[PDB]
Amino acid sequence: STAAVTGQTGLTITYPASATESAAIQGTFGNSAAIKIKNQTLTWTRTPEGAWSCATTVEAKFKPAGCAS
C-alpha cells in the first residue's frame, strides 16, 4: 500500500519526516510462522546518512548470518 498505512497489520513503516531521524521497516511474525517465533520482530533500520542495517529479537540460533547483530 503506502508508507503511512500498509495492507498488512504485521508490517509497519516508520518514515522520517526530516533529515535528523532514521527510517524503519518493522515486521512481526505470525499467521503461518512457527509458534516459537510467533511474536518476534525483525527490522531494517536506515540511518539519516543512508546506511542500512538489520536487527531481530529472535533467538541467536535462528538468526541468519546477515542479521546476527
Place this chain on the structure above:
Amino acid sequence: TLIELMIVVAIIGILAAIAIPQYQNYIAKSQVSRVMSETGSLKTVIETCILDGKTAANCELGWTNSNLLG
C-alpha cells in the same frame, strides 16, 4: 505289567508338571512396543503443525483407531 502302567502314569505326571516360563512378560512388552510405534507416527504430524502455526482444530491427524486404546 502293572509296573509298566505305573511308569506310564509317572511319565504323564512328569510331563504335566512342566514349568510355564511366565509368558505375560512377553506379550505385554510387545503390545507396549506396538504403541511406541503408533503414537510415534503421530510426531511427524504434530511438529509439522507446530512449525506451521496452525491451531489444534486446524491440525489434521491421519489417525486410525487401534485395537489397543493407546
